């Protein structure tokens, strides 16, 4: 496509405007302040983009998808807020600014995160217009599966219950990435795809596309680390990791072959960007 950066930027901008409006400061103020501090901090807004892109891909429009786009970003945000906590990563910074609990105390950060999780279902549920009830419920179902015990959270638990061992095989490492990363990206594309009015055959394609690009991200991150604690290069070396990555990328794009090329163009470029970024 032409100007993939321009496309990511306009999309992040619509998302940012919608996030701001969705989560206003209100009583009680520390709770909403804390929600906003991490939700509006910036970010590439990849999940919201995947969601809108998928909707448009199958003929839907951004506005129908916007609440869900915001929802997945809310989840993402709260997973990082909980992740930086002292019992977890115990980080003091994030984007050169104090981590959420350093700013509001651990108590607020936990709650503010639980509030984003809760509000995500609420917002999709109540704000989604231009889609029938059985369809909204169904995407509430998808969102739920992608972040629970067979998704985001499974990924996080298994990872914290493994940072104390070494016998981490390819299978274990893939579970963590499939769950701690791909899961929510699959959530995002499926939500968009369903709301857009996509068939099951199209939703399934997009489902594989997401699963490939999510695993593709972690693999390329590993390659890059070695270039310029189990990793793909330690398990199968850099050469095969790169081959795995080209295959992931090749397979993601295969999935998009039957959609209109112009509507698919964003997603395809996103895939290439993930496969070849220098950082």
């Amino acid at each position: 496509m032409f100007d993939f950066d321009g496309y990511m930027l306009r999309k992040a901008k619509s998302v940012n405007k919608a996030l701001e409006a969705a989560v206003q400061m209100k009583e009680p103020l520390k709770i909403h302040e804390s929600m906003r501090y991490s939700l509006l901090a910036g970010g590439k807004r990849v999940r919201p983009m995947l969601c809108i892109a998928a909707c448009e891909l199958v003929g839907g429009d951004e506005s129908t998808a916007m609440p869900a786009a915001c929802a997945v970003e809310m989840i993402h945000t709260m997973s990082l807020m909980h992740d930086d906590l002292p019992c977890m990563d115990n980080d003091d910074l994030r984007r050169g600014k104090p981590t959420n609990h350093m700013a509001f105390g651990e108590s607020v950060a936990v709650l503010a995160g639980d509030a984003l999780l809760s509000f995500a279902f609420e917002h999709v549920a109540a704000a989604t217009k231009g889609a029938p009830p059985e369809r909204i419920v169904r995407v509430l179902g998808e969102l739920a599966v992608s972040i629970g015990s067979e998704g985001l959270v499974a990924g996080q638990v298994v990872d914290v219950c493994s940072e104390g061992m070494a016998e981490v095989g390819l299978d274990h490492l893939e579970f963590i990435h499939h769950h701690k990363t791909a899961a929510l990206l699959q959530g995002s594309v499926v939500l968009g795809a369903i709301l857009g009015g996509g068939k099951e055959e199209e939703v399934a394609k997009l489902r594989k596309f997401a699963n490939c690009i999510g695993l593709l991200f972690q693999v390329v991150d590993d390659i890059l680390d070695v270039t310029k604690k189990t990793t793909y290069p330690k398990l199968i070396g850099v050469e095969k990791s790169k081959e795995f990555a080209d295959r992931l990328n090749r397979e993601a794009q295969e999935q998009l072959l039957h959609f209109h090329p112009h509507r698919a163009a964003p997603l395809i470029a996103l895939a290439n960007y993930i496969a070849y970024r220098d950082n």
């Binding site: 009680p28 709770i31 909980h82 651990e106 549920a125 179902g141 499974a154």
Partner: protein, 259 residues
């Protein structure tokens, strides 16, 4: 009355257990299950089922919503007793026992809340045409009650309570947010899923709002020995006032919840 209420807790427990199976990976499901049930039952979940029957519906039609309410409550219970490391939440007088560490508890709470919504979305029976609207509606109710202007607000404000030094007005308020909003939700959802019309839903909603505030008002009775019956009484009156119109066991099978 004791047996009817008892079979309700049992029906909900047997349903949760049928829904949460310890399986691979045990590191995830082991604590999900342990924490779903280590958490005290909440009448909000009971009230949801009793209200569905009250209006004519079958107990199963509300079973997913009641499990969801338990899970949200359970998740909050777990998160409220987390050993924080910065003194930002005063530790509960009776500091509860933790089997898993803070990180597993934190994550698991994050895994259980969506389990509630997964159950609801999953309970849609494609052969019943009114299901999607009502389930949808109930998903909005629960996510709101467990959200930032519902339970989390109570949970947050609760940390401002200084034992034996905070007014009853303030304490009642905390209970309204922390417990009332959810009981209001349980009854409202129960009526919704049972096919109740707008007026009955609103009435049951308000009853639960009062009833849950009273109920939580009781949990705290230990921390501040000032169980002024006048507040306890004022609540029951506003409540039973909402059952009036429903006349029958209605304004009765419910009052058992105020005994």
């Amino acid at each position: 009355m004791q047996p009817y209420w008892a079979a309700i807790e049992a029906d909900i427990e047997r349903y949760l257990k049928k829904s949460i199976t310890i399986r691979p990976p045990e590191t995830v499901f082991g604590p999900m299950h342990h924490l779903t049930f280590a958490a005290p039952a909440t009448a909000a979940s009971t009230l949801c089922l009793a209200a569905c029957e009250l209006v004519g519906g079958d107990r199963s039609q509300a079973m997913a919503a009641a499990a969801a309410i338990h899970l949200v409550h359970a998740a909050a219970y777990v998160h409220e007793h987390l050993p924080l490391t910065d003194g930002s939440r005063p530790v509960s007088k009776p500091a509860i026992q933790h089997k898993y560490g803070p990180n597993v508890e934190l994550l698991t709470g994050d895994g259980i809340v969506p389990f509630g919504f997964e159950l609801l979305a999953g309970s849609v029976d494609p052969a019943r045409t009114d299901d999607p609207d009502r389930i949808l509606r109930v998903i909005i109710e629960i996510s709101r009650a467990g959200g930032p202007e519902g339970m989390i607000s109570g949970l947050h404000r609760e940390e401002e309570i200084v034992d034996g030094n905070t007014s009853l007005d303030f304490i009642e308020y905390v209970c309204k947010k922390k417990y009332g909003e959810m009981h209001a939700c349980g009854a409202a959802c129960g009526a919704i899923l049972g096919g109740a019309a707008e007026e009955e839903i609103q009435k049951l909603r308000n009853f639960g709002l009062y009833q849950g505030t009273l109920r939580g008002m009781m949990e705290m009775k230990n921390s501040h020995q000032l169980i002024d019956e006048n507040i306890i009484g004022k609540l029951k009156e506003l409540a039973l006032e909402e059952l009036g119109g429903f006349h029958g066991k209605n304004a009765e099978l419910m009052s058992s919840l105020v005994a």
